[PDB]
A paper describes a structure:
Transthiolation reactions are central to Ub and Ubl conjugation pathways because they are used for transfer of thioester-activated Ub or Ubl from E1 to all E2 proteins, and from some E2 proteins to specialized E3 proteins. Here we isolate mimics of transient transthiolation intermediates for E1–Ub(T)–E2 and E2–Ub(T)–E3HECT complexes (where T denotes Ub in a thioester or Ub undergoing transthiolation) using a chemical strategy with native enzymes and near-native Ub to capture and visualize a continuum of structures determined by single-particle cryo-electron microscopy. The resulting E2–Ub vinyl thioether adduct was combined with Uba1 (E1) or Pub2HECT (a homologue of the NEDD4 family of E3HECT enzymes) to yield atomically tailored dithioacetal analogues of E1–Ub(T)–E2 and E2–Ub(T)–E3HECT transthiolation intermediates with substitution of the Ub(T) C-terminal Gly76 oxyanion by a cyanomethyl group.
To obtain doubly and singly loaded E1–Ub(T)–E2 complexes with and without Ub(A) in the same sample, E1–Ub(T)–E2 was incubated with substoichiometric Ub (approximately 0.8 equivalents) and excess ATP•Mg2+. Samples were vitrified and analysed using cryo-EM for doubly and singly loaded complexes to obtain reconstructions at overall resolutions of 2.5 and 2.8 Å, respectively. Whereas singly loaded E1 lacking Ub(A) or ATP•Mg2+ can transfer Ub(T) to E2, occupancy at the adenylation site by either ATP•Mg2+ or Ub-AMP enhances the transfer rate by tenfold. Doubly loaded E1 bound to Ub(A) and ATP•Mg2+ is most adept at Ub(T) transfer to E2 but prior biochemical studies have shown that ATP•Mg2+ alone or the Ub(A)-AMP adenylate can also enhance Ub(T) transfer from E1~Ub(T)20. To determine a structural basis for these observations, particles for doubly and singly loaded complexes were individually subjected to 3D-variablity analysis focused on E1–E2 to generate 5 clusters with reconstructions at overall resolutions ranging from 2.78 to 2.86 Å for doubly loaded E1 and 2.95 to 3.16 Å for singly loaded E1. Analysis of doubly loaded E1 reconstructions suggests that Ub(A) adenylation and PPi•Mg2+ release are coupled with transfer of Ub(T) to E220,33 and that singly loaded complexes bound to ATP•Mg2+ are suboptimal for transfer.
Residue numbers in the entry:
A (entry chain C): 2 to 148
B (entry chain A): 14 to 765, 780 to 1012
The structure:
């Protein structure tokens, strides 16, 4: 557990994630605060989103708990920060690194999946009135994800 | 009329129909020694109609080797007469009687007949009758480290269930015109060739919805075939298939017929030539007893061994057995003829009791027909086993001294064991230790810890407890009961009410763990198992792990410096459903049950906690405004539960329950259908509500409906409990109050700055001040499955069934809801007995200090199919460090409490390794990539001071060591794993 977490941390340190920066909170290895940069080709451009990662005691045999801290207007992310990611609930295997999870979350931010949504109202707006969805996403990422 | 408060865990293994048929069956048990009493105890706990005992032989001292209902004051009294009184207390629904004499015709009164300690001629006489009258016959025998079971249920036995597995079911994607049924994406049906299935909810092929079973031809892990469906239709879309299980007919042979041509069951495939040997050996034992006035061969006697081998030769010649007799094994059977071990008795009694249950219930696949077993690998080799050491001494351990000798008895009597847990396996282990004489010497001791209390459902498989003990601590009751069984354990047992975990290291510390000889786990969760495994690895103590699940069970042994630990293996994790599936799109009853549990927690537990914390913590609002993920939710909960919706009577509670019904079963569904209409399509043009997504429909409140009324009653009662009001159950008040209810209008909303903080502040200041409410608290609802008067399971069942009605899912009953929501683990007494027997058979290997890894056996078994298997433990992995052989698990570094710089220099100069990471507990003490200033501040500090500074907590006075995890790189930069560090404070 500890050795695997430190190996992942060192791998992150050796090769910068460029679009991400994860590190332990204080000195606790089972609680990380990661940062994600909004993709340029997305409504969340120019945004900084903070995520909290809680490694379970049985890591890597149980999925880490990843929750958004910054408010985001996304069909697959609810108000509590829960992320509708398959690799975090039942598809988790002891072979996925935190860099892969952050890349998956960035890809999710790149293009949402409204056909299996977590927030039905945002998904409905996305499917029906695309322009209003874009405006709402830009407003949210300007109000919350900046400063 | 089954008492589900007592048979709760057993009904999840057997079922209601099986137990109903079981409670109408009579069992006769001939022989009341250790094996007989074990079988009778298991049968009485199971719940058969009644049990009759027949054993007119007077009690003797050696009989106490495995008979725990006999005391030394009963010497000279018939065993059955002294055992019936103690057996009658185990279960109040199962009368226990005694018969002085047996006649053949009398056997017609019983559903099953079990025979032990009876000669072969009498067994033939009994079986010749029981076979032709269709009476189940079981014959069991235990000789030293050898055992035999024989089952004969008649020529036309009907077995409804052959494996004990739930019927397979699944969701279909498409069925072609040739019957090729395909599962949904990445879904495995699990069927096998020759199975029968029935389809329902099939679109395009209504003919398959009749329910007629159809053959299965598996074509792959995702598809199968059912034959030709040409006439019914061309193609079928979606639908659910369910397996159909058909009865089987099993034909048994009589004992007389099967003596000549037996049919063996092999408990192990490494020794497949032995059962033919034991078949001759046991018959030779019977012949020898007949030729010597019923006296078995004396322990470790060569003359008797030679005579027994001559009998074996004669029997083999007579039966035309074309098998070469193994003299060593046969003479070993001769030597241990008078042995009587409690572990073998427990193992065989569990197996035989399961066979009796199979006979009575016509369930699971029975043994067919001879089952010969041996644990000869347990015989000590580090002590002297001869005729002089194994001769009886006129004590209660004669049956065991006849197998192991007096020196091994002295070794056992000075054990210092530690038993974690006092559940069913704990009680069985304590009984076995008491019978074996463990820790009855001057230097012996037993320690048992358990923080739980005795409940009604625990009495069904924990025989050391009685109804008068409900509500008391398990460890104290178990210690008292075992001290009653073996008076020599008076003062040799210590009982703790401490949970084994990080918070109890002040009690189970270095001093406590340094005096032990072995640790035995009797736990039910993986966290405590892993913790105890880590502690044993650190202190280098043998560990005995054992677990059960329904009729399945396993036992593992961990030996220092020899095998791997318990945590070196991985088991399947628990399945948690996606949040989106639970929130909006459920398709199985489990999803609705999980949603109902979440609703219960969010309605009756969390808002109460928020209200209580607001009235206690002076600075709760400010902390919540910037700490919690939804301060507005917390403020709304506080307001609603304090001022806005505070009930003044139970009528207001009923109105609130009606409002919540509308909120959760009528309005959210309308909103969901407004967002995603039933005619909506996905981005690819396919219909949205297709496949795993079922279109819901809002519910209209009908008071006459049963589910609606149940939900209203449960919700109102729980709300009243939260506010401490007087609840009621008469339907008249509910019907009167709910008649005058006007539903508020609701229309789905289409949607379409910093003032929000101002609104939050306005809400906050609208709340009453904490000073105005002193001494006022709201009672939260803590989930409790085992109580049927708190409306918890009732509420969960009602909510789950209502949500199933929303999505057209088949509702479940309160039984299945309690099974799913409570995470109840099915349990049986027979499985507990079997695992206790196996663990105690490995314990003697541990005591003897066996070194080779081939002499130990990890065991697995499944009693529903009669499967037993044993495999050698996995050796601990080795590694190369600095050109030396290091054990990955059982090696460590021992260092003083030096400074961090000194530790790094030691690792550089001794091991030639560069330290890159050093951590202790859950804190990162040192990392190679930290800024130089931080390291320069931390380098000259001692390890203990560094840990205290980083963890912000002083070390406890009882702390005597530190366990450090270190990651280091070699000279070339290649990462090399190293064992942990043991800093001595
Ligand atoms: N960490 C622990 N430390 C000490 N004892 C423990 C620990 N975890 C579990 N136990 C005890 O282990 C025993 C497990 O036995 P068992 O599971 O049969 O009982 P139960 O959990 O009370 O019953 P049931 O699961 O049938 O409702 C219980 O006495 C439980 O108190
Ligand atoms: Mg309990
Ligand atoms: Mg339990």
């Amino acid at each position: 557990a500890l050795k695997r977490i430190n190996r992942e941390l060192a791998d992150l340190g050796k090769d910068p994630p460029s679009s991400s920066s994860a590190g332990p909170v204080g000195d606790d290895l089972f609680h990380w605060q990661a940062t994600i940069m909004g993709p340029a080709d997305s409504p969340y451009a120019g945004g900084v989103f903070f995520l909290s990662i809680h490694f379970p005691t049985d890591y890597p045999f149980k999925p880490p708990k990843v929750n958004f801290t910054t408010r985001i207007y996304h069909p697959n992310i609810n108000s509590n920060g829960s992320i509708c990611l398959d690799i975090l609930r039942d598809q988790w295997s002891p072979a996925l690194t935190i860099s892969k999870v952050l890349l998956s979350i960035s890809s999710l931010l790149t293009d949402p999946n409204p056909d299996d949504p977590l927030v039905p109202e945002i998904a409905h707006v996305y499917k029906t009135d695309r322009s209003r969805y874009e405006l709402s996403a830009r407003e949210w990422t300007r109000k919350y994800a900046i400063g | 009329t089954i008492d589900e408060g007592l048979y709760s865990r057993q009904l999840y293994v057997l079922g209601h129909e099986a137990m109903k048929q079981m409670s109408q069956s009579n069992v006769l048990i001939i022989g009341c020694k250790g094996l007989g009493v074990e079988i009778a105890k298991n049968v009485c706990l199971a719940g058969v109609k009644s049990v009759t005992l027949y054993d007119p032989q007077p009690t003797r001292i050696e009989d106490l080797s495995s008979q725990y209902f006999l005391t030394e004051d009963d010497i000279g009294v018939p065993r059955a007469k002294v055992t019936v009184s103690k057996l009658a207390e185990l279960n109040q629904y199962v009368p226990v009687s005694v018969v002085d004499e047996l006649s053949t015709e009398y056997l017609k009164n019983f559903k099953c007949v079990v025979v032990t300690e009876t000669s072969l001629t009498k067994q033939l006489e009994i079986n010749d009758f029981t076979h032709k009258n269709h009476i189940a016959y079981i014959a069991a025998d235990s000789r030293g480290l050898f055992g035999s079971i024989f089952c004969d249920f008649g020529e036309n036995f009907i077995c409804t269930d052959t494996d004990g597995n739930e019927p397979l079911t699944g969701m279909i994607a498409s069925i072609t015109d040739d019957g090729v049924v395909t599962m949904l994406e990445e879904t495995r049906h699990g069927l096998e060739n020759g199975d029968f299935v029935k389809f329902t909810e099939v679109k395009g092929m209504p003919g398959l919805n009749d329910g007629t079973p159809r053959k299965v031809e598996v074509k792959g892990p995702y598809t199968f075939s059912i034959g030709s469906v040409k006439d019914l239709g061309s193609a079928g879309y979606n639908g659910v298939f369910t397996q159909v299980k058909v009865p089987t007919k099993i034909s048994f042979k009589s004992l007389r017929e099967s003596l000549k041509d037996p049919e063996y069951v092999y408990p192990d495939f490494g020794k497949m030539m032995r059962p033919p040997q034991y078949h001759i050996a046991f018959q030779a034992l019977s012949a020898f007893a007949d030729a010597h006035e019923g006296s078995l061969p004396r322990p470790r006697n060569d003359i008797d061994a030679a005579e027994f081998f001559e009998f074996c030769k004669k029997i083999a010649s007579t039966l035309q057995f074309d098998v070469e007799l193994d003299e060593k094994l046969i003479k070993e059977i001769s030597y241990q003829a008078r042995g009587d071990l409690v572990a073998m008795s427990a193992f065989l009694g569990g197996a035989v009791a399961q066979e009796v249950l199979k006979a009575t219930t016509s369930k699971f696949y029975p043994l067919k027909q001879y089952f010969y077993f041996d644990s000869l690998e347990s015989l000590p080799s580090s002590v002297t086993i001869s005729e002089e050491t194994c001769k009886p001494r006129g004590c209660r351990y004669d049956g065991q001294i006849a197998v192991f000798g007096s020196e091994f008895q002295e070794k056992i009597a000075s054990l210092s064991t530690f038993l974690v847990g006092a559940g069913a396996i704990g009680c069985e282990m304590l009984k076995n230790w008491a019978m074996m004489g463990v820790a009855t010497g001057e230097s012996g001791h037993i320690s048992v810890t358990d923080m739980d209390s005795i409940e009604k459902s625990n009495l069904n498989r924990q025989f050391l407890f009685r109804p008068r003990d409900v509500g008391k601590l398990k460890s104290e009751c178990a210690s008292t009961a075992v001290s009653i069984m073996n008076p020599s354990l008076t003062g040799k047992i210590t009982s703790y009410q401490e949970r084994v975990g990080p918070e109890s290291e002040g009690i189970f510390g270095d001093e406590f763990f340094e005096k032990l000889s072995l640790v035995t786990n009797a736990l039910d969760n993986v966290e405590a198992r892993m913790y105890v495994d880590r502690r044993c690895v650190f202190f280098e103590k043998p560990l005995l792990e054992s677990g059960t699940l329904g009729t399945k069970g396993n036992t593992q042994v961990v030996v220092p410096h020899l095998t791997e630990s318990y945590g070196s293996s991985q088991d399947p994790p628990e399945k948690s459903f996606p949040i989106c599936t639970l929130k909006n799109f459920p398709n199985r009853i489990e999803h609705t049950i999980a949603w109902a549990r979440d609703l219960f927690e969010g309605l009756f537990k969390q808002p109460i906690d928020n209200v209580n914390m607001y009235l206690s913590s002076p600075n709760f609002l400010e902390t919540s405004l910037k700490t919690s993920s939804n301060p507005r939710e917390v403020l709304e909960n506080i307001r609603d539960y304090l001022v806005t919706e505070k009930p003044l009577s139970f009528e207001e509670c009923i109105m609130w329950a009606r409002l919540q019904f509308d909120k959760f079963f009528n309005n959210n569904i309308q909103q969901l259908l407004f967002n995603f209409p039933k005619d909506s399509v996905t981005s690819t043009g396919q219909p949205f509500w297709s496949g795993p997504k079922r279109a819901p429909t809002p519910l209209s409140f009908d008071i006459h409906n049963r589910e609606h009324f149940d939900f209203i009653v449960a919700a109102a009662s729980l709300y009243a409990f939260n506010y401490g009001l007087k609840s009621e159950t008469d339907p008249a008040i509910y019907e009167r109050v709910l008649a005058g209810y006007n539903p508020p209008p609701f229309a789905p909303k289409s949607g379409i700055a910093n003032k929000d903080k101002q609104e939050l502040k306005s809400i906050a200041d609208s709340l009453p001040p904490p000073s105005s409410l002193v001494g006022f608290r709201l009672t939260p609802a803590e989930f409790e499955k085992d109580d049927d008067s708190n409306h918890h399971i009732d509420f969960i069942t009602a909510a789950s069934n209502l949500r199933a009605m929303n999505y057209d899912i088949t509702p479940a009953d309160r039984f299945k809801t309690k099974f799913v929501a409570g995470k109840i683990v099915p349990a049986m007494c027979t499985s507990t007995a079997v695992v206790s027997g196996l663990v105690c058979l490995e314990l003697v290997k541990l005591v003897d200090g066996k070194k080779k890894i081939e002499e130990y056996k990890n065991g697995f078994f499944n009693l529903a199919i009669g499967l037993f298997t044993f495999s050698d433990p996995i050796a601990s992995p080795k590694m190369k460090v600095n050109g030396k052989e290091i054990d990955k698990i059982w090696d460590r570094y021992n260092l003083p409490d030096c400074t961090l710089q000194e530790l790094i220099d030691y690792f550089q100069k001794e091991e030639g390794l560069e330290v890159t990471m050093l951590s202790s507990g859950v804190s990162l003490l040192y990392a190679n990539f930290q800024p130089p200033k931080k390291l320069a501040e931390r380098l000259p500090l001692k390890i203990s001071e560094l840990v205290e500074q980083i963890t912000k907590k002083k070390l406890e006075p009882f702390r005597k060591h530190l366990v450090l995890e270190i990651c280091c790189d070699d000279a070339n930069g290649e990462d090399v794993e190293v064992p942990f560090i043991c800093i001595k404070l």
